[PDB]
Amino acid sequence: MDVLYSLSKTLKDARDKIVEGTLYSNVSDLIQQFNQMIITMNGNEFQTGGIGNLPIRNWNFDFGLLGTTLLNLDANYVETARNTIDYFVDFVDNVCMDEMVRESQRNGIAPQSDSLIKLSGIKFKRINFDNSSEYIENWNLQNRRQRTGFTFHKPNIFPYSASFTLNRSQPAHDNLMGTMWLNAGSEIQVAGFDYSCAINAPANTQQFEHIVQLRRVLTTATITLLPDAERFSFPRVITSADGATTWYFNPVILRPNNVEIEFLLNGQIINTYQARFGTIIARNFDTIRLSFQLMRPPNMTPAVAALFPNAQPFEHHATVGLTLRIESAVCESVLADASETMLANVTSVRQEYAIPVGPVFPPGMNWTDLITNYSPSREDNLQRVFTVASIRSMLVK
Amino acid sequence: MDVLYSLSKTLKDARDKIVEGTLYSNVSDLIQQFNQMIITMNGNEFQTGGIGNLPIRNWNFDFGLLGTTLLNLDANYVETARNTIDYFVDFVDNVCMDEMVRESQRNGIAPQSDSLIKLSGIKFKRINFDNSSEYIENWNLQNRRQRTGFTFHKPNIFPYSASFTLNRSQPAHDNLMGTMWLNAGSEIQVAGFDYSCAINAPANTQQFEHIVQLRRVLTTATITLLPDAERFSFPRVITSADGATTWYFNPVILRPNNVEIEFLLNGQIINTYQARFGTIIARNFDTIRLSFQLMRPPNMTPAVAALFPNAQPFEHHATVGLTLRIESAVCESVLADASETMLANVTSVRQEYAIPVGPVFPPGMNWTDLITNYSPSREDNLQRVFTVASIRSMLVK
Amino acid sequence: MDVLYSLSKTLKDARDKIVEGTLYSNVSDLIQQFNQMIITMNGNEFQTGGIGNLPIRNWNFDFGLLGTTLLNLDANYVETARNTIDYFVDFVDNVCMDEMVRESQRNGIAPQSDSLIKLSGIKFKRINFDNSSEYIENWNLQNRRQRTGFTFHKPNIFPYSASFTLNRSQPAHDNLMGTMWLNAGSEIQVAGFDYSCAINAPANTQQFEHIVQLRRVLTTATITLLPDAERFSFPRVITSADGATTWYFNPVILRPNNVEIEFLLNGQIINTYQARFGTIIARNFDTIRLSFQLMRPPNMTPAVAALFPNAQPFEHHATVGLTLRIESAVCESVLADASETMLANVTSVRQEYAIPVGPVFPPGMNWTDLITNYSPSREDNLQRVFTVASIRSMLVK
Amino acid sequence: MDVLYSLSKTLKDARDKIVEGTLYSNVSDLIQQFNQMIITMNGNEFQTGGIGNLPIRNWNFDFGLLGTTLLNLDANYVETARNTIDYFVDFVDNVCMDEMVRESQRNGIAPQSDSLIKLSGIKFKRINFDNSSEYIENWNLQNRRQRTGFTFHKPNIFPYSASFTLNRSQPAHDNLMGTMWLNAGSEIQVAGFDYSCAINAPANTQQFEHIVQLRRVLTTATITLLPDAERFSFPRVITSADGATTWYFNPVILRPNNVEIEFLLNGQIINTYQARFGTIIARNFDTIRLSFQLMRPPNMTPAVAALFPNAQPFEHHATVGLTLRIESAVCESVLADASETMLANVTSVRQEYAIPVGPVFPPGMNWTDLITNYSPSREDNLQRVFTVASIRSMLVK
Amino acid sequence: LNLYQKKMKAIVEDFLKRLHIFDVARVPDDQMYRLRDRLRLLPVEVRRLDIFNLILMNMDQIERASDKIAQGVIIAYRDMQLERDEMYGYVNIARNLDGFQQINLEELMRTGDYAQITNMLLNNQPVALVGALPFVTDSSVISLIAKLDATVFAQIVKLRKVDTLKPILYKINSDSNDFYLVANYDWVPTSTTKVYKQVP
Ligand SMILES: [Zn+2]
Ligand SMILES: [Zn+2]
C-alpha cells in the first residue's frame, strides 16, 4: 500500500519539477528516486479490472532510464520523459479504481485486487518516499498503533434524522407539547413547543431536552450555537405519530430560557455552556445534550396576552429553539465533511463502473446508512478506500 | 508565463529557507537555482503600468551573486540577501498587477503586458522550476491539451436568480399555484404552492418541478438535500408578474411528496434520488431537476381541516419545498467558491487602481453577470487572471 | 496517434509510387522510410477487436527488407513487395476500426484500444512523416494549441427543427399570426403569416423575426439568401400547439418587406444585410437573425382586394418568407457536411459490427442529437474518430 | 509573385514533413530549399499594413540555418525550428492581407504593396518551386498566354435577378400572359403563365421563352434540367410593373410542352435538347435559351374543364415552367462557386480590417454587382486577390 | 561542460589504474563502456559536486577577465564612433551584443561552413561572431584611417578553419602613440568595428 503512495508523489513531484529549462541540481535527488522505480518494475507484469463494467487491462514494463548527464534541460528531454509518465498515470488510475471497488468483511483493511496484493510484495518496497500527504501520514501512524487524527470543515457526523416526539398529545392534536428536530451533517436544530404556553406548568416553565449521540468522538470542535430554530418557526401540517392523520403547528417564538449545552464523553460532562450563544469550543465529546425551557412571559402587553388564553382553543403555539453547527473538528476516524472529495470520489468511481453492491458498504455508499451503522469493518474499508482516493487525486482530478 | 511562476516559488522558498543560522547544505540545491536567475536577468530593462491609476515604475538589473562557502549562515549573509529580494518582490507585484488588468477578445488566453510578453521569450526559459502550486499545475496540463480540474468548497455555479412562476393565477391573486425560488452560489431553494391545497386536483396531488441548468459541468459533487424551503415559509407581499400590483402569500408547510432529484448530463440521467434527504453524491452533471408534489392530506384533524375549505377564500396557502446545497465539487473550468480568494484578488486590484471596464469582463467583475454569460473568452481570461492571482498570493497577501 | 497516420501515407505513397518500371531514384527517399518501419515493428505483437461483433485478431511481425540494389524495377520486385503491403493494409483496417468504436467521457481525446495505446509508445515514434493530409494537419496544430480550421460544402450546423409559433391564435384557428420554419443542415426556411393581412396593424405592417443559434461559430461563410419560403407556400393542415386539433393554412405569398439579416457573434452584429438577395458573405458568427415584415398592399386590383376583406372569415392567408443556405464555411470544430464521408464512415463501421451504444455518442451517432448537445467530450471524441476515419480512407474506401 | 507562392508550400511541406521522428533523408531535398530561403532573406527589412484598420508592423530577419542531426529528428530539433516558422507564418499572413486589399484600375494585375513589389525583384526568384497548387498552376499558364481553366461546383455565374414580363396585361390584371423568373448563382427557374389558358391562341398553344446571357463562357457543364418551376407554383400578390398597384397570381401547373433548351456560343447553337429532363451536358456556351409552351388540354375531365371557362373571370391561371441547375462547369475566369472560400476570404479580410471602398470592386465585394459588370480590371484584380487567398489558405484557415 | 569528446575510455583508464588491482588492456570493450554506463547514474559526493557548482558560476567572469582573448567581434560597415574608457583610453570596445545575429564559431568550425556567413559578408551585412578569440592591439592612429579592421576577415573564406582570425583593437592613448596628429585637428574616430572583451 504505502508503495502505491510513492508511485504518485513520484509522478506529481515529477510532472511538476521537470520542465523545459531548470537546472539538473534541483532534481538530482529526484531523478534518482525515479529511475530506481523503472528498474524494480521492468520485467513484472500486471492485471487490473474484471469486475462489473470495469475493463480488464494488462500492463508490461520495459523502459529506458534517464539522462543523468545534461546540465540544464532541453525541451527534447521533457517530451521523451512525459511520454513515459503518461503510461504510468493511465496506469495508476486503473490501479486505484480497481482497488477502490472491492470490499471485504473478514479483513476489510488489507489489499484486495490482484494488482495491489502484488505490490505489498517485498521486492517493491524499494520505492517508498516523502509521505507528507496528510492521509498516508495517518495511514502509517495507525499501523504502528498510535494516535492518528484528521481535519474537517463542517464534518458529516449526524445521520439525517428529522422527527418529533409528542410528550403531551390527544386525538385532536389541539394541545400538544414536545420537540421536533433535524440532525444532519454537522448541524442540529431543535424546537420545544407547548400549545398551552405553560399555563398549568410548575413555575409556568416547560422543560425541554434534546440528546444527540455521535457515532465517533469529535475533538477540538469549533461550534456556533444560536438561539431559535428557524426551521421550526413556521406553520406546518404534520403527519401524526401513527400516520393516521395530520396535526397543525402554528408557532410563535420566545427566547429559550435557561439554555444549557453539555458535551459529554462516556457520560461525563467535558464542556458545559449556560446560555452562551456565538462561538464555543467542545474539546472532546461523543454526545451533545441541549436543555432549554419555555417560560410563560410573566408580563404581557395586550397583543401578547391575546395569544395565550387561560382556556383552549390554543391557536398560537409557544415555541423555543436552538441551532448548533460544528464548523470544524478533528476525528480519529475518517468521515465525510463539506470540503473533502473522498466520499464523492469513491462513490463516483463505483457508480460510473456499475460496481455491484458488496458485503460491506450500504447501497450507493449512502452516507446516512454508513454513519448510522459505522461498524469497524465499514471504517477500515472506508479508510482504505479514502486513502486510495486521496492518492489518486494527486494526479487525477 | 510558467516563467513568472518560478520567479515566486523562487522567492518564497527563499524568504523562507534563508534564515540566520540554517545549515548551507539545505539550500545548496536552492542557492544555485537562484543565482541562475540573476544572470539571465541582468542586462534587461522592464516597464510596468501606464493604465488608469496604475503608476509606471521602471526597472533595471545589475546584481552580484552569493557566496557558497560557510557551513552555517551568519546574520550578515541574510541582510545582504534580503535587500536583493525586496527589489524583486516589489517588482513581481508590479508585474502581476500590470498583466492582471488587461483583457483581449482575441487571445484572452495569451500574455498581454509589455512586461510579460518579454518573459515568454526563449532566453528566459532557463529559469523554470518546481511547478507544484495547484494552479500552475493545471495551467500546464491544459496548455498541452489535456484533462484539467480544480477543487471548491461551496462553489459559485448559480448566477443569482430569485423569482416565481404562477401556473394558475387571476387578477385578485387569491387562488394561485406555482413555484418561487432562489438560486445563488452553490444553493437552490424552491417552493411549490397551491392556494387550493389540491382540492380539485387529480388524486388531490399537485405536481411541481424546478430545473436549473449549470453553465459548466460539475463532477464529484457532495450535496446536502433537505425537505422544506425556509426562505419561502413565511408571509410575503410580492409584486405581480407585470409589476402592476402586489399579492399576498401566507404559507403553511407540508412535507414534499414523491421527491425526485435528477442530476443530468446532456439530457441523460446520471444520478437520481427518490426522497433521499441528507448527503448525496452527484458524480457528473450539467443540470439539476427537482420534482416534488403537494398532496392534500387525506386525513385531517379539525385544526388542519379548518385551514383547507372546499370553497374560497383560501387563506392558508399549502406549500411544499426543497433545499439543495453543493458543499464541494470539481470543475474543469475556474469558478469562484466560498474559500478561494482569486476572484476577490483580481476584483480588488482592478478596483484599487481604477482600472477602466474592458471588452471582456462585466463591469466590476460582477460574478452573476460573468457566470450567466460565461463565454470561452471570459473563461480563458479568467483562468489567466486567476492563475496570476494565485502566483501573487504565494508572496503577497 | 500521429504514428498511425504515417503507416498509411507510407502505404499509399507506396502502393502508388512502386510499380513495374520506374527508376529507383524516384523512390530512394521513400524506400528508406519504409524499411525503417518494418524494423521498428518486427518482434512486436498486437491485438485488435474483442468488442461487440468485432472479430479478435492477433498479428506478428517478421519481414525481410527491400532490395536497395537494383536500378529499375522488375515485375518480380513488385509482387514480392505487394505481398508484404497487403498484410499491413488488412492490418491497419482492423486497427482503425478497433479504435473507431470506443468512446470515453473523462479522456475522450486520447487513444483507447490496446492496439493504439501501444503505438503512442516512444519506441515507435521513429516513423512519423509527410503530414499534409488536411485532417492530421489540424490534429497537430490543436495539440500545440493553435488556430485550427476545416473546409465544408453545405455544412451540417443546424439540428433538424421543424415547427411554428402562433403569436395570435384562438380556438377556431381562423385568424392566426406567427411563424413556421425548417432549420436543417445548412439551410433555414422561415415564413411569417398573418391571416388578417395586417388590417388592424400599425402602419398595416406585421413584423416577423427568426433567430437561429449555432452550436459552433462558422467563419468565412458563403451564403445564398432568397426571398420566399417555398416549403411554406402551400396549403396545409397542421396540428395545434397542444396536439388537440388541426388548423388550416392557406397561404398567398407577398414579398418580404424590410428584410434584414444579421450575423452576430456573442451578441454583436458582425455582418448585416438589408434586403440583399443572392450571394452574401458572413465572416464570423454564432447566430443568425432574420427580420422581415408583411406589409398590407396599399393599392390592390379587384382580384387582390377580394382576398383581403375588412372582416373575417379570412380565407387567404398573407405570407412572407426567406430562404438562407450556407454553401460553404470554415469551422474550428469538426462537423458533418454534404461532401465528407467521415460521419458516414464512423457510423457505418459501428453499425456493421453491432457496436453497443456507449457513454459519449447518441444512439446511432444521430447527427441531430449530436449537434444539439455538442459537448466538449463529444467533440473531442468526434475529432479523434473523424481523424481516424480519414486515415483509413487513404487506403480503404 | 510566384515567389510568394513558394514561401508557403515551403512552410506547409515544412510544418508537415518536419516532425518528431522522421528519418532525415525524407527531408534532405527539402531542408536545402528551406535554408536557401533564410539566406536570400536575412538583411532586407519590410513594411506591411498602413491602410484602414490594418496595423503597420515591421519585420526584420536574423536567423540561423538548419542543423542535420542524423537518423530521425529529436524533439529538440523541431522546437528550435517551429520557433522560426511561426515568425514567417505571422509574416506571410500580414503580407497576403496587405496585398489583398489594394486595387488598381490601370494595372490591377500586378503587385501593389510595398511588401510584394519588393519580392518580384530579381534577387529573390531563387526560391520558386513545386507549383502544383491549382491556382498558381493557372497563374503561370496565363503569364505565357495559354489555355487556363478552373473547376467549380454550383458555379456562381448568374447575378441575382428576380422579375417578370407581362406580354398581355390590362389595368385590372385579370387576364395576364407572360413570364416570371429567378436567375441566381448556378440556377434558373422560369414560368410562363397565360390566364386565358390559350383559349383564343393559335393551335391553343402559347409560346414562352427565357434567355440568359452569361458574363463569361462556361465549358464542360453538367446540368440538371427539370420540368416545372416550384418557386412560381404558388399563389402570389405581386407589385405591378409601374409599382402603382398589386396583381394576383393563382397558378395551376401543366407540363411544359415542346421544351427546347439551347446552349449558344456567340449566337451559334452548340448544344440543343428537346424535352430532355434529367442530366444533360453543355460543352461550351455563353447563353442559355429556354423555349417552352403552354398547350390548352384538348381533353378535360369536368374538374379540369371547370378551371378553364370560355369567358372571364379567369380564376385559375395556367402555368408551365422549367428549372435548370449547373452542377459543375469549367470557366477560364475566376468565379465564386458553392465550395471555394476565395470570395469569402477576400471579403472577410476586407470587412474585418475596415478596408475603405476602392476604385475597382463594388462596395462589400458584392457578388451580384461584381458579376453584372465583370470588367477586365475587376477580373484581373479578382484573380490576383483569389490567388493570394488560396496561398494564404495553405497555412491559415 | 559540453565536452562532447573524451568521456568514454579516457577517465575509465586512469580510474582502474589507480585501483591497482588490475591491468586494464585485457578489459573487453563491452566492459569499459558498460562501466561508464553505470557510473554516470550516481549522485556526487557533496564535496566534489559542491565545488563544480562554484566554478561554473564564475566561469564566465574569468574568461572575459583575461588580458589576452575576448569573446567575438562585430562588423557593421557603418562608420562608427569609437568609444572611450579610462583604462584603455580611446578604444573600440562593445560591452554588449544585441541587434546583430550571433554565429557560434564553435558550431561553424566544428561542422563545416555553408557560407551563410560567406553571403552575409559578401553582400556586406551586419553580423557578429561569438566565442573566445585571438587578439591584437595597435597604436597606429593611421591604421584606423586605413580601415585595417575591415580586412582580416576576407581570409576565412579560402578554406574553412577560422583559427587565423586575429581581430583588431586600437589602444589609442593620448600618449604612447607617436601617431598623435589627431587631437591637433578637429575630428572624431571612425572605427568600422569593435570587440566584446568586457572591462577588467
Ligand atoms: Zn462554508
Ligand atoms: Zn451542392
Swiss-Prot record, chains A, B, C, D:
Assigned GO CC terms: T=13 icosahedral viral capsid; viral envelope; viral intermediate capsid
Q: Name one GO molecular function term.
A: host cell surface receptor binding
Q: Give the superkingdom in one word.
A: Viruses
Q: Where does Ca(2+) bind?
A: 266, 286
In residue numbers, the region (Interaction with the inner capsid protein VP2) covers 62-73
**Where is it chiefly localized?**
virion
InterPro entries the record matches: Capsid_hemagglutn, Rotavirus_A/C_VP6, Virus_capsid_a-hlx_vir
Name where it's found: Virion
Sorted UniProt keywords: Calcium, Capsid protein, Intermediate capsid protein, Metal-binding, Ubl conjugation, Virion, Zinc
A GO biological process of this protein is: fusion of virus membrane with host plasma membrane
Annotated binding of Zn(2+), by residue: 153
How is the protein altered post-translationally, as described in the entry?
The N-terminus is blocked. Sumoylated with SUMO1 and SUMO2. Sumoylation of viral proteins seems to have a positive role on viral replication.
- Indicate the impact reported for residue 70 to A: Loss of in vitro DLP transcriptase activity, no effect on particle assembly
Other remarks? The VP6 trimer contains a zinc ion located at the center of the molecule. The zinc ion is not essential for either trimerization or transcription activity of the DLP. Zinc-depleted VP6 has an increased sensitivity to proteases.
Relate the protein's function as given in its record: Intermediate capsid protein that self assembles to form an icosahedral capsid with a T=13 symmetry, which consists of 230 trimers of VP6, with channels at each of its five-fold vertices. This capsid constitutes the middle concentric layer of the viral mature particle. The innermost VP2 capsid and the intermediate VP6 capsid remain intact following cell entry to protect the dsRNA from degradation and to prevent unfavorable antiviral responses in the host cell during all the replication cycle of the virus.
Subunit details for this protein?
Homotrimer. Interacts with the inner capsid protein VP2. Interacts with the outer capsid glycoprotein VP7. Interacts with the outer capsid protein VP5*.
Instruction: Give the UniProt family note.
Output: Belongs to the rotavirus VP6 family.
Recorded protein name is Intermediate capsid protein VP6
Q: Which organism is it from?
A: Rotavirus A (strain RVA/Cow/France/RF/1975/G6P6[1]) (RV-A)
Q: What is the lineage of its organism?
A: Viruses, Riboviria, Orthornavirae, Duplornaviricota, Resentoviricetes
Curated annotation (Swiss-Prot), chain E:
User: Where does it reside?
Assistant: Virion
Query: What does the function comment of this entry state?
Result: Inner capsid protein that self-assembles to form an icosahedral capsid with a T=2 symmetry, which consists of 120 copies of VP2, with channels at each of its five-fold vertices. This capsid constitutes the innermost concentric layer of the viral mature particle. It encapsidates the polymerase VP1, the capping enzyme VP3 and the genomic dsRNA, thereby defining the core.
What is the annotated quaternary arrangement, including any partners? Homodecamer; each decamer is made up of two conformers of VP2, called VP2A and VP2B. Interacts with a VP1-VP3 complex. Interacts with the intermediate capsid protein VP6. Interacts with NSP5. Interacts (via N-terminus) with NSP2.
Q: Which domain of life is it from?
A: Viruses
This protein's species is Rotavirus A (strain RVA/Cow/United States/WC3/1981/G6P7[5])
Task: Please quote what the entry notes about the protein's domains.
Answer: The N-terminus binds RNA. It is necessary for encapsidation of VP1 and VP3. The N-termini of 10 VP2 molecules form a cylindrical hub underneath each 5-fold axis of the inner capsid.
Q: How is it modified after translation?
A: Sumoylated with SUMO1 and SUMO2. Sumoylation of viral proteins seems to have a positive role on viral replication.
What name appears for this protein in its UniProt entry? Inner capsid protein VP2
UniProt similarity note: Belongs to the rotavirus VP2 family.
- Where do the TM regions start and end? none
